[model samples]
Target: MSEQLTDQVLVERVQKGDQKAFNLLVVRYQHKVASLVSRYVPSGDVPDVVQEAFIKAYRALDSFDINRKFSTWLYRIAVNTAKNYLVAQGRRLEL
Candidate 1:
């Protein structure tokens, strides 16, 4: 936390079961996630989509490929989660 730690550093900590490290990742990415979600869903839905995306990322972090850019992976996850939510809302509306 002293200087700019790489996502590699944080991801390794989370892989070792550190929830705090995971939380830092969440905090770092939440705004970008929310913005991504907003592009796919209503303003009101942004918060939940972002939260769910972070949870999904946290759960899947163990298998996350460190060789890949963590931000790229996270953006993909958040965008997909938001799009899935948007799709579900459309389906629910249809029903």
Candidate 2:
């Protein structure tokens, strides 16, 4: 396997409007994001949370702070996406 690029490098490329770089970012972080979101979702629903988080993240990529740890920022987005998904599903009481 190839060595992973630094998150800062990926974010820089992404900010420059590189779709491939963003894709790499999504692939690099998907597992961690899935695991984090899984805690808030039903077993079978984890994929939905991951997908939604990716879409949400992509749309908001321009707002990302270059100085922050990318994974930490992404985790916050993922968690917020999970919370939104739960609320939309009317499962807010369980949260």
Candidate 3:
């Protein structure tokens, strides 16, 4: 077996409810999510968006597919969460 593990390994562990695997996923993607959210949110609200993104990701983890790139799916979740947050705060209009 190869020592170099694929992201699919971590994703499978996460789907199986492994907390350590989930934490690794969070650490790996947090920065990406933060940067994506920052493009729309003010700098001061970046932390809030990050927190909300993780919460949404955790809550929706079961829906994630093993064949997909976790980060790409997660990025979509984060962006949607940030947009919803801004809409809820009345900073953006709903479509």
Candidate 4:
């Protein structure tokens, strides 16, 4: 089941402790995140990288600026997370 709430509403709900809202946010971005992270990560860890990014984003919502774009932030978190994973597995390096 999915709601028709806007991202702004969903974000508010999440900040107010509604886990379900975060679930909706995940639904909204899951595909994009998978696509973006896959470029830098293997299929084996795509899910993990995406999962950690969402988890980290979820945990950091308290400090998230309402003025910023959510997807931009989420995308950054995901790419960096995937990069870290690749670095961990020695598949990539950070300068």
Compare the candidates by lDDT and give the number of the best one: 2
In model 2, where is the ten-residue run with the lowest total lDDT?
86-95
Put down candidate 4 lDDT per residue, 39-68, tens digits, no spaces: 998798798889998989998987788677
Q: Tell me each candidate's TM-score.
A: 0.90, 0.86, 0.83, 0.85
Q: For candidate 2, write residues 1-95 as lDDT tens digits.
A: 87666878988898889979989889889989999999999879888889888988887888888887888889998899988888888865665
lDDT of 1 by residue, 32-59 (tens): 8787778888887789888888889988
Q: List the residue pairs that clash in candidate 2.
A: none
lDDT of 1 at 11: 94
Stretches of candidate 2 above 4 Å error? Answer: 1-4, 91-95
Off by over 4 Å in 3: 1-3, 91-95
Best by the TM-score measure = 1
Better of 2 and 3 by lDDT: 2
What total of clashing residue pairs does each candidate reach?
0, 0, 0, 0
**Clashes in candidate 1: how many?**
0
TM-score of 4: 0.85
**To one decimal, what is the Cα RMSD in angstroms of model 2 from the true structure?**
3.4
Please give, for residues 18-49, the per-residue lDDT of candidate 3 as tens digits: 86887877877887889999998899988888
- Candidates 1 and 3 compared: the better one by lDDT is 1
